[PDB]
Write a protein that binds this ligand. Sequence first.
Ligand SMILES: OC[C@H]1O[C@@H](O[C@H]2[C@H](O)[C@H](O)[C@@H](O)O[C@@H]2CO)[C@@H](O)[C@@H](O)[C@@H]1O
Ligand SMILES: OC[C@H]1CNC[C@@H](O)[C@@H]1O[C@@H]1O[C@H](CO)[C@@H](O)[C@H](O)[C@@H]1O
Length: 314
Amino acid sequence: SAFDLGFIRGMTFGFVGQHGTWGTDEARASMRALAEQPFNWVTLAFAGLMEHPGDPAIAYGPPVTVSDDEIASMAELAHALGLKVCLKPTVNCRDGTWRGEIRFEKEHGPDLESWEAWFGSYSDMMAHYAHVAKRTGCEMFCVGCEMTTAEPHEAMWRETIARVRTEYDGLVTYNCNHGREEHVRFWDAVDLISSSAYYPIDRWRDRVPVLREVAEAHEKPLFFMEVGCPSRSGSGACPWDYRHPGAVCLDEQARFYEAMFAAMPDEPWFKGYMLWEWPWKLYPREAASEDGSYCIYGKPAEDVVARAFSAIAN
Ligand SMILES: OC[C@H]1O[C@@H](O[C@H]2[C@H](O)[C@H](O)[C@@H](O)O[C@@H]2CO)[C@@H](O)[C@@H](O)[C@@H]1O
Ligand SMILES: OC[C@H]1CNC[C@@H](O)[C@@H]1O[C@@H]1O[C@H](CO)[C@@H](O)[C@H](O)[C@@H]1O
């Protein structure tokens, strides 16, 4: 199933999945526009909310996130447009702190500000959405994203994953941050290794050997659950950084994709690309030259990716 998996030509849709936004005419129009492109996968991504990086409570569902029925509506539409769907619940902090820096002073204590408490909340969230993934026939489920500070809590990640397996029979991945592929201890517990592969333009050429080594060592396919670059000046040096300032620069985004596609080998361990990202409210192509986001629609990167993905498809 993991070994046999068709090469992934994917796009992430709809983040952060704010309540009500996917049930709109706009979101429907955006998903249709996505499906005009040579993608075989879409990821429905959304974030629950922590107040602070040291708070064990996670808010998800309405009024924060899209409802379960909004998720189902988008999954149904995607499937009817011929796409396979990955469901990706994650968590953000209201103060803007990256989820890769969540931290607790205590390991244990269900009613304390502890790792145990936080994983209790997170595990309930994952079980909730693994069940939604089953309901909606999602072909993949992503159990976490860029949780660098949480990753050493290996027993707790294994408990979380096991719970997902009781609720969901499809492909399961965990999405680590770039630079963590060779660090995560629990790849044996998922079906596919995946990362947020925001490697700078000039590093693709020399990062490939470690990606190859990780995949081959774990006898599991590896793919990128996030990859992209904003269309802003200099962003190619820090494609992970959504806050990087810069004038709109369409070619810089294209150069990122050209560098990535040049470097990635045609070898069976590598299973492809889930691009970051596509908004639920899509700008018209006439406005694309003034857009500095990760979206490739209406920009030269659209053609770079479509040329690459059409060639893979054919
Ligand atoms: O990779 C996407 C996330 O990147 C974060 O920034 C990290 C970066 O990834 C590297 O670990 C590093 O150069 O240090 C940074 C932390 O300051 C954040 O920009 C997140 O919002 C991204 O999701
Ligand atoms: O920096 C690009 C990605 C890297 N991985 C996680 C993801 O959060 C990040 O994207 C941005 O996410 C924030 C909300 O977390 C959003 O405001 C931005 O506009 C990007 O989608």
